[PDB]
């Protein structure tokens, strides 16, 4: 019951791969949910190099709606993976608790689930055992997909384990005998999750289990009058039993209902002595390789747009002056341009101190404020 700096407690839920338990940090009290896989039940290979490739592969998948994996702790008896913890529970428990939900919250959950499934598809991984019991909610009422790639072990063994182990959530292709299941299973399971969010009840649910498989093979499903016909047209286009007519990510993104309330951050792609001391090479001013009269016109335009009062003795010698808005006193400085070579020109700033007036505020910090607004306008 001790991994890293985390003691363990009770059991959060039951998983066919392994039991998921909660862990608590002994000092801070942070909660980390660790999935514990029994090696004696399922182990394809005992090579440590494949474990190293798994550690290299699974850690680099960061997404704001996919549950992040922290590390994979090896053990001669079990397999430990420390995932993050959420306090909202499973989606299916939320459906059983609250029944029917609003459409504006169901679309907000569905867009986040689709943005996680499309992220998994862009990283070439599918979640064949997808169901509302494998997606979670946080404290902020978002959606978190639990296991993105762990269903591959269920796919590796036999397809009969997929039908017998998960009789309710099973694709028509898998029960029809397709050995390899692709993203069409993800689209169908996301449609089942969307129907569960929109209606609360299951789309295909029979007491007799081969009758349930026959009803899954049947295209027809019950439609209530609560939902407007656009989203049930989307569900009919999305829940086709043949994968040629089943929708894609682009086919959902081109739909009218999906584009009503869409946050921009969901899709990453828009098209579909003791201490160390380090020296710094400081720069005096601005090295501009242009005509000096044009640089003087640029500085004049900048100090005109910054509302400064200025007078020139020489054309290159610019004494500017501004009155502060909140501070009653005024500050005085002087600009001068330098010729280091025939190509580039250096602009230099020189303040003059206040002679007799005990001015309020700080003279040198207001001198830095007379240039922190000027360098942003010049940007050179």
């Amino acid at each position, epitope marked *: 019951v001790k991994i890293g700096h985390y003691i363990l407690g009770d059991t959060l839920g039951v998983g066919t791969f392994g039991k998921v338990k909660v862990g608590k940090h002994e000092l801070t009290g942070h909660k980390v949910a660790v999935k514990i896989l029994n090696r004696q039940k399922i182990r*394809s*290979l005992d090579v440590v190099g*494949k474990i190293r*490739r*798994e550690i290299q*592969n*699974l850690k680099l998948f960061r997404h704001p709606h996919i549950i992040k994996l922290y590390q994979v702790i090896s053990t001669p008896s079990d397999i430990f993976m420390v995932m993050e913890y959420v306090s909202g529970g499973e989606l299916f428990d939320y459906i059983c608790k609250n029944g029917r939900l609003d459409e504006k919250e169901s679309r907000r959950l569905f867009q986040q689930i689709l943005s996680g499934v499309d992220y998994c*598809h*862009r990283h*070439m*991984v*599918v979640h064949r055992d997808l169901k509302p019991e494998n997606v979670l909610l946080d404290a902020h009422m978002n959606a978190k997909i639990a296991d993105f*790639g*762990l269903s*591959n*072990m269920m*796919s*590796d063994g036999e397809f009969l384990r997929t039908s017998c182990g998960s009789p309710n959530y099973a694709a028509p292709e898998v029960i029809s005998g397709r*050995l*390899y299941a*692709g*993203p*069409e299973v993800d689209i169908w399971s996301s449609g089942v999750i969307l129907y569960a969010l929109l209606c609360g009840t299951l789309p295909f649910d029979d007491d007799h289990v081969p009758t349930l498989f026959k009803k899954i093979c049947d295209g027809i499903f019950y439609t209530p009058q609560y939902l407007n016909p656009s989203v049930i047209s989307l569900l009919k286009h999305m829940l086709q039993v043949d*994968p*040629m007519k*089943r929708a*894609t990510i*682009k086919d959902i993104r081109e739909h009218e209902w999906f584009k009503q309330d869409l946050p921009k951050y969901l899709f990453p792609e828009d098209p579909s002595k003791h201490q160390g001391v380090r020296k710094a090479k400081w720069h005096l001013g601005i090295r501009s390789q242009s005509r000096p009269n044009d640089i003087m016109a640029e500085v004049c335009r900048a100090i005109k747009q910054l509302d400064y009062e200025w007078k020139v003795v020489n054309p290159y010698y610019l004494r500017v002056r501004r009155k502060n808005p909140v501070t009653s006193t005024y500050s005085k400085m002087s600009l001068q341009l330098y010729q280091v070579d025939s190509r580039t020109y250096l602009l230099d700033f020189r303040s003059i101190d206040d002679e007799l007036t005990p001015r309020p505020g700080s003279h040198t910090i207001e001198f830095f404020e007379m240039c922190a607004n000027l360098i942003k306008i010049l940007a050179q």
Partner: antibody
């Protein structure tokens, strides 16, 4: 129930444009990349074309670069290999094959070709 | 971008044969093997040169030794007389092998 039926083959005049299709029935063309290969009589396989509709990225061999434009229609699940300015060397049977780029296991990135078509025979002769 | 070069041999029924595939550059475990009967479609046997593709049973086996990919056929049935092809897809341009043919001993 996946069958890759080819069409548009036969005999062509050298210097003419040909467009053979691949009716992908049983799966969806938007996720998987349709790859064309060349099987000369007596020789082995030879990769010629590729199109991946999910990210919109294509691939080509070094010998047929910029001359055999590939096209994919996701509405009818077909793959159009529009060949242009063909030479006398390109005389073979053209197989159609889907491609599975996904992680089937946690450790093994599967990158093979699962399902193969019957292939039509094009003959180029003056 | 690279080339492949398998071997070529012939043996009897039930003999243990091997087919090498020397990769040119440094590649990963992304090498497949396609069995093509004469006048038929190339059937897939092993997809990543180490684990068996579902379908065809465990007679076909492959091992990985650096850049020398092997295909071992133990207990050769009298129906498995076809042409075998190496296939490298890790680089990005797909390059096939020269193709080895298995002839019966006479």
């Amino acid at each position: 129930e996946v069958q890759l039926v080819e069409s548009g083959g036969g005999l062509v005049q050298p210097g003419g444009s040909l467009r053979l299709s691949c009716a992908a029935s049983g799966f969806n063309i938007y996720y998987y990349s349709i790859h064309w290969v060349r099987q000369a009589p007596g020789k082995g396989l030879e990769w010629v074309a590729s199109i991946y509709p999910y990210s919109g990225s294509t691939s080509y061999a070094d010998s047929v670069k910029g001359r055999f434009t590939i096209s994919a229609d996701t509405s009818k699940n077909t793959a159009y290999l529009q060949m242009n300015s063909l030479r006398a060397e390109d005389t073979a049977v053209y197989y159609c094959a889907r491609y599975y780029p996904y992680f089937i296991s946690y450790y093994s990135k599967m990158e093979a070709m699962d399902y193969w078509g019957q292939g039509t025979l094009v003959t180029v002769s003056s | 971008q690279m080339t492949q070069s398998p071997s070529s041999l012939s043996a009897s029924v039930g003999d243990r044969v091997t087919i090498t595939c020397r990769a040119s550059q440094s590649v990963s475990s992304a090498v497949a093997w396609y069995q093509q009967k004469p006048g038929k479609a190339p059937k897939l046997l092993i997809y990543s040169a180490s684990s068996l593709y579902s379908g065809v049973p465990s007679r076909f086996s492959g091992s990985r030794s650096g850049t020398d990919f092997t295909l071992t056929i133990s207990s050769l049935q009298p129906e498995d007389f076809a042409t075998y092809y190496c296939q490298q897809s890790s680089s990005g341009p797909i390059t096939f092998g020269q193709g080895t043919k298995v002839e019966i001993k006479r």
